Design an enzyme around this catalytic site. Structure first.
Site, PDB file in Angstrom:
ATOM      1  CE  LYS A 109      -1.940  -2.411   3.359  1.00 58.08           C
ATOM      2  NZ  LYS A 109      -2.902  -3.147   4.235  1.00 58.08           N
ATOM      3  CG  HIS A 239      -0.988  -0.605  12.237  1.00 54.28           C
ATOM      4  ND1 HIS A 239      -0.570   0.665  12.598  1.00 54.28           N
ATOM      5  CD2 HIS A 239      -0.523  -0.821  10.985  1.00 54.28           C
ATOM      6  CE1 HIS A 239       0.133   1.190  11.599  1.00 54.28           C
ATOM      7  NE2 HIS A 239       0.183   0.303  10.609  1.00 54.28           N
ATOM      8  CD  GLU A 313       0.953  -6.629   9.013  1.00 49.91           C
ATOM      9  OE1 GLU A 313       0.427  -5.867   9.874  1.00 49.91           O
ATOM     10  OE2 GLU A 313       0.402  -7.584   8.410  1.00 49.91           O
ATOM     11  N   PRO A 314       5.856  -2.880   8.250  1.00 49.52           N
ATOM     12  CG  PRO A 314       7.986  -2.621   9.097  1.00 49.52           C
ATOM     13  CD  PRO A 314       7.068  -3.686   8.425  1.00 49.52           C
ATOM     14  N   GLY A 315       5.464   0.081   6.365  1.00 50.33           N
ATOM     15  CA  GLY A 315       5.292   0.602   5.017  1.00 50.33           C
ATOM     16  C   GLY A 315       6.080   1.904   4.911  1.00 50.33           C
ATOM     17  CG  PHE A 360      -6.306  10.530   1.392  1.00 48.52           C
ATOM     18  CD1 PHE A 360      -7.473   9.853   1.623  1.00 48.52           C
ATOM     19  CD2 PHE A 360      -6.241  11.338   0.273  1.00 48.52           C
ATOM     20  CE1 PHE A 360      -8.523   9.968   0.736  1.00 48.52           C
ATOM     21  CE2 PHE A 360      -7.317  11.486  -0.573  1.00 48.52           C
ATOM     22  CZ  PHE A 360      -8.452  10.790  -0.354  1.00 48.52           C
ATOM     23  CG  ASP A 361       0.307  10.109   5.492  1.00 49.66           C
ATOM     24  OD1 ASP A 361      -0.113   9.214   6.325  1.00 49.66           O
ATOM     25  OD2 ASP A 361       1.532  10.322   5.116  1.00 49.66           O
TER      26      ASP A 361
END
Lengths: 440, 440
Positions: A109, A239, A313-315, A360-361
């Site tokens: 993602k 998370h 699960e780092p993105g 969004f962020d």
């Protein structure tokens, strides 16, 4: 601020190699199915594929220098990204050095650039997919030896996605609600379910317990339903919300996850797996180190079992520092504040594309005037015909002029991923570089 | 609420045809270079190209019926759009009927679907492009006889865009700032410049005078610069802001535009052209009719000259009512308000894609439960792993269950256009229909 940390990279690559007798620098196998020699090769292959030009040395000054160089089919004033694939490798090294117990599964993602997926595959990372499309992009480029190396970390998935993961041989899938159990039981009978739990994510940049994560209470009925629909509950995830600097939160979550492991046994479930998800920052307050300091103890205490493998699960971690966006100031005009003068400029990227992160962020990216002229009340806009395509509104900043460039560092996460093509403007030009020695 | 207005369509098509001796129903040639016979043919061709299934009759009930029918390579629960290309034609008819003086140039930005561009080409509309990409999408599908049928309505354009419009033979280009004049003079010497002016757009849905439109004062220096860089100022444009119901605004703008026309002469400029831009609503308070009522008088008064051709740039008008989105409710779970129960559902489209309008367009779309169960505190989310991908938060609504569908009508404008592909979820399935008789 450092342009790189050569040191870590070196060590990372050495570990598990003949030049140190296949000896690891902790109790833990190097990540992945490749040998240390095989792993360094696979990475140099990728670097060659994408014509990566190595370029070694502050971070800012490293970027400002590289930008002057890269300004001179695509136009000369077009916007472009300088992608430091070396910083990706470095982040992978930094992670092994600090948490060898924990194998990172990269969250597609955050930036599904094919070169980034390819580098991370070759470094022994697993893959966190959230859709059938993400699953197909990893299997269709064969970035894994096995469908055991993919976690489907979407607690809420469409039936057509469940069906296509089953047929692809994918196994490890998330859940956090009763109705979801039933669905997994049905479409994925080969499923190794992992329960996602809620967290105290109020300190994060992006808090997701609102939508996802079974609350502590409900865990019991969820377990009960798993036993009931013949579903194999092989673990627990969580998370603490994306861009979370709160260390107490990671400690807290592991604790909660322990008490679950306990609850799980009573229903006929021996939990193998602990996924600590994401939320770790990718840019140089709270450091990634400070976080690991407070996590390692707790993993030691309750999951220093040895019977349980630990994953993440780092993105953002991986990709954020990798990318720098360059935008040309191509138009300008001055107005009158209500002789006080607003200086409006127009740049070739913006809200509809790379800067969607502002919305969004909740990002607040940094705007760097390439060759810094007095402080004006400045307003900056993106190329689109919309007034809301504005990245800065009426805030002090040097007078600029046309032909100037803006450098925006740390744009590797949750920017292009989600970016759209409104008014038909996109950033397409990509300059691949490396800040780290590897492939002579 | 009416499912269609057959009447208008009929009349639209008849005008300029042999069956009425080539006679127009106003002083004004039918829009376009095609004959009335040629025009009806070209349209039936497009309908065949896209396998358009005619389907004649309220609007809501028309949609609810068509949706039940269209629910039974793509999955059966996938999200999809029912595109009524008949409603596009109808909007074109409605526009000729109400403003024959005004030739519409469709704003590609609002929905660049190739079938929509093709229908509008065949109906005699011109094209409003904002980027080199939009220009190339109209010329590369040859939707015009000439580059005179494209307005480049971006007051602020990159030099590589100016260069590619020059080389494509494009002429009619917008401006609103001194620095822009200089640029046009240079890259487009074949340019017919149109001056965009500011407006009192405070009543709109989306107000763009912030970013675009020379204020009344500055017009003089702008004119002066045009004469100076050898730039041919052939007109005046304006936009009263997208989704504006304020009729006074359109009256006001025309007035302001008149006084400019006057100012223009003194510098050696005979203005041919008056572009009244957009802002007209596409859905059935303030009607499109009420707006035309207040515009036609004023056009009569000051531009009832006859020496000046009058044009528009509607985007939303045409497309908004055309599209209906269907989304499957594929997951659900219940929480506890702080036995009060929040009902959370998860649907296969959302903020990152079709519902980006909620943020860039300030849209408030309508959510229709297909087969309407008690009123729950409901929260609805899109498919992505983000909590902010939420279209409804904790508001009353029927209890739903999995397999249910949501119908969202009036989704044809500023939705897919700008929509992105985050988490790799898009709506791809398209069902083409027509609400209007044309092509037996």
């Amino acid at each position: 601020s450092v342009a790189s940390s050569q040191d870590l990279v070196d060590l990372f690559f050495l570990e598990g190699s003949q030049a140190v007798d296949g000896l690891c620098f902790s109790p833990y196998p190097i990540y992945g199915w490749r040998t240390a020699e095989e792993r360094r090769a696979a990475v140099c292959e990728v670097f060659k594929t994408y014509n990566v030009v190595t370029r070694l040395p502050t971070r800012e000054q490293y970027w400002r220098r590289l930008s002057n160089l890269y300004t001179q089919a695509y136009e000369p004033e077009d916007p472009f990204y300088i992608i430091d694939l070396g910083r990706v490798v470095e982040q992978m090294a930094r992670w092994r050095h600090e948490l060898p117990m924990v194998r990172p599964y990269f969250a597609v993602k955050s930036n599904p650039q094919p070169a980034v997926l390819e580098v991370l595959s070759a470094l022994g990372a697993g893959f966190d997919c959230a859709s059938k499309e993400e699953i197909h992009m990893v299997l269709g480029r064969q970035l894994v030896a096995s469908p055991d190396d993919i976690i489907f970390a979407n607690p809420c998935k469409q039936l057509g996605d469940l069906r296509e993961a089953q047929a692809c041989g994918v196994t490890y899938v998330t859940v956090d609600n009763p109705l979801e159990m039933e669905k997994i039981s049905r479409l994925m009978p080969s499923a190794h379910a992992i329960i996602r739990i809620k967290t105290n994510d109020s300190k994060a940049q992006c808090s997701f317990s609102t939508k996802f994560g079974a609350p502590l209470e409900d865990v019991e009925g969820l377990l009960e339903a798993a036993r009931q629909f013949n579903v194999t509950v092989c673990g627990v995830s969580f998370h603490v919300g994306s861009g979370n600097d709160d260390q107490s939160a990671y400690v807290s979550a592991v604790r909660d996850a322990y008490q679950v492991f306990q609850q799980a046994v009573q229903y006929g479930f021996k939990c193998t797996i602990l996924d600590i998800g994401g939320g770790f920052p990718g840019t140089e307050n709270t450091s990634f180190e400070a976080i690991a300091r407070t996590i390692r103890p707790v993993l030691a205490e309750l999951f220093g079992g040895g019977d349980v493998t630990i994953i993440s699960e780092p993105g953002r971690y991986f990709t954020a520092a990798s990318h720098a966006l360059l935008m040309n100031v191509f138009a300008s005009r001055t107005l009158r504040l209500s002789e006080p003068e607003e200086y409006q400029y127009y740049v070739n990227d913006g809200l509809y594309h790379s800067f969607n992160c502002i919305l969004f962020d909740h990002a607040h990216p940094t705007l760097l005037l390439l060759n810094d002229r007095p402080l004006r009340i400045t307003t900056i806009f993106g190329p689109t015909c919309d007034s809301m395509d504005c990245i800065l509104k009426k805030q002090p900043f040097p007078e600029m002029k046309l032909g100037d460039w803006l450098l925006v560092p740390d744009m590797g996460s949750y920017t292009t991923a989600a970016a759209g093509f409104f008014n038909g403007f996109a950033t397409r030009r990509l300059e691949w570089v490396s800040s780290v020695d590897l492939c002579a």
